[PDB]
Ligand binder design. Structure first.
Ligand SMILES: C[C@H](Cn1cnc2c(N)ncnc21)OCP(=O)(O)OP(=O)(O)OP(=O)(O)O
Ligand SMILES: [Mg+2]
Ligand SMILES: [Mg+2]
Lengths: 554, 413
DNA sequence: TGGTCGGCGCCCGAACAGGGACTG
DNA sequence: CAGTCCCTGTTCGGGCGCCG
């Protein structure tokens, strides 16, 4: 029914009044059910009629539920919400089946008319005023107001979760050895008791709840393995996600692509190797989520490959705190990666991906660490632990990069897993001039307001060159220039520069960039067996400098 | 019940802290929870709900193989919002007498602020939330009734009382300087460790039978120089070998408007082979030893203006090689130095970087009565991921992250 | 016909920000 | 100094998925 728990105090944003919008028309169907609900709600006390004295009103409606003769009465409190104070959302994320430890007994209860069991503070009620239209379009609609957490109000969620804990508090406190994963009104009760003794504790809990205004009707999973919880299927020794169907269609619109990626992203927690880069990339041109978009080959494929993975059935295991937590990552190409966290080989708890391209000039070791990060954070969130890693990168390639990178980078305890593709720096830079090597003095520039500009070089053995760039810029030149000094040189070269924009990009050993020019500068760098790049201050007349600028300054 | 909970207000038109709690470890939450449990059973904290829209992150950290967890709250975002309450109305006079102290000793006393009922109308700001492993339960919240450790006002409102608690031992040992920052209390003297340490042991017996309770640890930041910006010492110079000392001294010039260029710039006016050897003339060869003198002669343009915030820059060199650039103005380095890994087991990049933020900050306080605004050389996600692991200062400097190539490390290297 | 709320994930664009390079 | 450029990071919001 309705609970004696202490009502939570609620104020309105300084100097604001309640909502006063009218009830935009509703079908003769919805009305039939709203008045069917309200009668029950009013009779029960969850709401009360109100007269002229109440100067507020908000529009309401209803929805149907999955396989339910049941409707969901909602209220369009969009207006009130703005005018309502703001709260501190107490829900910090979501539980993951792969974090549950194996239990001897599991139960799942679901509180009934959840929100409608928790009272709304006496003084705020005035605003929750709404009106139920008449279908014969005559009688002035009936007006009521809430006396319990209304569905669709900005605050009810936080209040319900809050009260719920407060309600469970004593039970929890007196039955410390019993786990109770609560998410809104859904309760998963775990125990290491025998059927008998656990089923008794599951009863005491239920009663306590009822006694505290909370009903646990038979929607209560018992010898229900597989239990339905949080969108999974919880079996005695494995769990899996529920049927996750993708849409098979002819022509794709944008929101279609949104839905696809959405679900696929969701399946990537258990189905290993789902990838979406190409399918998503297909959504850069901001447009109507009704605008039909043409699929690219590189996407048509990854769609079908994915669509395939989703066919073999898969599942995941539960957590064993007495064992180590392992996570291994593999390179899926073009920035993408896939990983799985297991404890016993082949029996992984979870899987996941990483495809964020942080930066414009980075390599695969930068990304590989970007991932080890995500996987720690995440792994802490679920297990409150940090994994031991298995990585496709030489125990050396690493001691190379970090011991040579200007930034402090780190990786937790880890070991090498020779399971190519392997990760490696596609080339190095001599950090000491190369004897007998045409030393090139390179530079270039371009005019601010005009179109073009240019860049070129000169040698120490007598050689001169320059190229007329177009629409370039102060930077697009230094690079465009160091580009020639590569092809126009051989296995061993020594380029010199006064720009930092280019020495910086290149010193990071980047092997992937957004700009086509950069990529060419790398490609070449891989072919050479020795390259050195030193820097010297621009416009300070240094031996070899001025000549180059001149050839270009024009 | 005549207590005296001083009222406090936030700067003009400034809402309170509304920052999200970040992931912790089983070990940290089990502690953070065993703590709050106690803290509440003594009304220092009170469970609170969703209706309170303010929040601050919190966690714990171990200390000195004492295996004693200690809560900690990142009040940074509050201290920035808690009005000049601690600045324009209740400042702290620079006790520069510390810089010189032969042997200083840091001691955390804040474990006492918990005896000073905090203004109720303000408590509502001290809101913080503990989370759950794998998210089994919603966030359990709380509030402060007494004074929150690691808060700006917290040490202020209390110093009035502190001072008086000190007159006995503080008037009987005027030689010693006593400073208070945040939760910590610094005691600078000149006696040798043999007796100087035995004296701090007395400050204790004074403070414990007066309420307070506090469970090498010493310092002498002055008894360690700013390491100068050194140059090479060769007897054969290559083309780049020179072009380096040049470009280096080129920028190392802004820190000394007087530093010679041409004599060493003349040595090359054409496209020369980097490998090529080209020793110097006696003038430029005299410059190397001249411009070389200006690098033992402390810079000139430094004035500690308390009116602005101490920024800081840091560099990662090689094998535990980190460098300091504490300055308030560009090139106007008020103080620099370095930090290397000790003859103990080798740690990693971040573990050090952090220690090399605490040390630089500890000094910063003793030398200026405040903390910097570190420009960091690490990637946010990386920093924000492990930092809390290797920390132990009961305070937290503000900071930002910057990715900038070196060769500009040549100068401190 | 459609229309509500809170949490978290992903991805994209937009809006900032801050440096270094020039120019007035 | 401004007044701009480039360039690169970061934050915020929106759309979708999943949960109640
Ligand atoms: C109100 C709460 C959260 N919730 C669930 N769905 C919604 C929604 N569409 N809008 C707002 N809140 C929503 O629903 C819990 P729920 O279990 O979905 O429904 P109920 O009211 O508890 O009734 P029953 O037990 O018979 O299933
Ligand atoms: Mg329910
Ligand atoms: Mg140039």
């Amino acid at each position: 029914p309705i609970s004696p728990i202490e009502t939570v105090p609620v104020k309105l944003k300084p100097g604001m009044d309640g909502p006063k919008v009218k009830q935009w028309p509703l079908t003769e169907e919805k009305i039939k059910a709203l008045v069917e609900i309200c009668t029950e709600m009013e009779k029960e006390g969850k709401i009360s009629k109100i007269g002229p004295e109440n100067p507020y009103n908000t529009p309401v409606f209803a929805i149907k539920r999955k396989d339910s003769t049941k409707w969901r009465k909602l209220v369009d409190f969009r207006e009130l919400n703005k005018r309502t104070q703001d709260f501190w959302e107490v829900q910090l994320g979501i539980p993951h089946p792969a974090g549950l430890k194996k239990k001897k007994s599991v139960t799942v209860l679901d509180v009934g008319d959840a929100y409608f069991s928790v009272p709304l503070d006496e003084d705020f009620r005035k605003y929750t005023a709404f009106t139920i239209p008449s279908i014969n379009n005559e009688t002035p609609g009936i007006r009521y107001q809430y006396n319990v957490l209304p569905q669709g109000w900005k605050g009810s969620p936080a209040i319900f979760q809050s009260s719920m804990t407060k309600i469970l508090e004593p039970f929890k406190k007196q039955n410390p050895d019993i786990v109770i994963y609560q998410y809104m009104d859904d309760l998963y009760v775990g125990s290491d008791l025998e059927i008998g003794q656990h089923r008794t504790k599951i009863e005491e809990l239920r009663q306590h709840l009822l006694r505290w205004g909370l009903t646990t009707p038979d929607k209560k999973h018992q010898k229900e393995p597989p239990f339905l919880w949080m969108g999974y299927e919880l079996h005695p020794d494995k769990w899996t996600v529920q049927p996750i169907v993708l849409p098979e269609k002819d022509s794709w619109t944008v929101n279609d692509i949104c839905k696809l990626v959405g679900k696929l992203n969701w399946a990537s927690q258990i189905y290993p190797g789902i990838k979406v880069r190409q399918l998503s990339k297909l959504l850069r041109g901001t447009k109507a989520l009704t605008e039909v978009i043409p699929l690219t080959e590189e996407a048509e494929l990854e769609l079908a490959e994915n669509r395939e993975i989703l066919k073999e059935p898969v599942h995941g295991v539960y957590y064993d705190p007495s064992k180590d937590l392992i996570a291994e990552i593999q390179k899926q190409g073009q920035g993408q990666w896939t990983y799985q966290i297991y404890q016993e080989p082949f029996k992984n708890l979870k899987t996941g991906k990483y495809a964020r391209m942080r930066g414009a000039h980075t390599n695969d070791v930068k990304q590989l660490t970007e991932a080890v990060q995500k996987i720690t954070t995440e792994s802490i969130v679920i297990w409150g632990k940090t994994p031991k890693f298995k990585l496709p990168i030489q125990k050396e390639t690493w001691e190379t990069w970090w011991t040579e990178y200007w930034q402090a980078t780190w990786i937790p305890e880890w070991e090498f897993v020779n399971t190519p593709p392997l990760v490696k720096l596609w080339y190095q830079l001599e950090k000491e001039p190369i004897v007998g090597a045409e030393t090139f003095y390179v530079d270039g520039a371009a005019n601010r307001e005009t179109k073009l500009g240019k860049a070129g070089y000169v040698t120490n053995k007598g050689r001169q060159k320059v190229v007329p760039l177009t629409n370039t810029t102060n930077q697009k030149t230094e690079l465009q220039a160091i580009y020639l000094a590569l092809q126009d040189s051989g296995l061993e070269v020594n380029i010199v520069t006064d720009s930092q924009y280019a020495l910086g990009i290149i010193q990071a050993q980047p092997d992937k960039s957004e700009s086509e020019l950069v990529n060419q500068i790398i490609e070449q760098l891989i072919k050479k067996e020795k390259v050195y790049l030193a820097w010297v201050p621009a416009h300070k007349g240094i031996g070899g400098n001025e000549q180059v600028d001149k050839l270009v300054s024009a | 019940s005549p207590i005296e909970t001083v009222p406090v207000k936030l700067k003009p038109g400034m809402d309170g802290p509304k920052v999200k709690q970040w992931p912790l470890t089983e070990e940290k939450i089990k502690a953070l929870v065993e703590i709050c449990t106690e803290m509440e059973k003594e009304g220092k904290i009170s469970k609170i709900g969703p209706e309170n829209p303010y929040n601050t992150p919190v966690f714990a950290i171990k200390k000195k193989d004492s295996t004693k967890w200690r809560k900690l709250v990142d009040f940074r975002e509050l201290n920035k919002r808690t009005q000049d309450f601690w600045e324009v109305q209740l400042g702290i006079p620079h006790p520069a007498g510390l810089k010189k102290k032969k042997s200083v000793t840091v001691l955390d006393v804040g474990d006492a602020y918990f005896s000073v009922p905090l203004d109720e109308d303000f408590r509502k700001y001290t809101a913080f939330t503990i989370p759950s492993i794998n998210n089994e339960t919603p966030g359990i919240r709380y509030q402060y009734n007494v004074l929150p450790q690691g808060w700006k006002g917290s040490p202020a409102i209390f110093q009035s009382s502190m001072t008086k608690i000190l007159e006995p031992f503080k008037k009987q040992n005027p030689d010693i300087v006593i400073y208070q920052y945040m939760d910590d209390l610094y005691v600078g003297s000149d006696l040798e460790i043999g007796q100087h340490r035995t004296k701090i042991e007395e400050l204790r017996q004074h403070l414990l039978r007066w309420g307070l309770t506090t469970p090498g640890y010493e310092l002498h930041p002055d008894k360690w120089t700013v390491q100068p910006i050194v140059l090479p010492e060769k007897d054969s110079w290559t083309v780049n070998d020179i072009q380096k000392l040049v470009g280096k001294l080129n920028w190392a010039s802004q820190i000394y408007p007087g530093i010679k260029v041409r004599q060493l710039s003349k040595l090359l006016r054409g496209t020369k082979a980097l490998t090529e050897v080209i020793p110097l003339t006696e003038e430029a060869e005299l410059e190397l030893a001249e411009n070389r003198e200006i690098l033992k002669e402390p810079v000139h343009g430094v004035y500690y203006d308390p009116s602005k915030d101490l920024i800081a820059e840091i560099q990662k060199q090689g094998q535990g090689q980190w460098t300091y650039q504490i300055y308030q103005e560009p090139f106007k380095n008020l103080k620099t130095g370095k930090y290397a890994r000790m003859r103990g087991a080798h740690t990693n990049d971040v573990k050090q970087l952090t220690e090399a933020v605490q040390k630089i900050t500890t000094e910063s306080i003793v030398i200026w009565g405040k903390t910097p605004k570190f420009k960091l050389p690490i990637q946010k996600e990386t920093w924000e991921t492990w930092w809390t692991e290797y920390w132990q200062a009961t305070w937290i400097p503000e900071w930002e992250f910057v990715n900038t190539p070196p060769l500009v490390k040549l100068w401190y290297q």
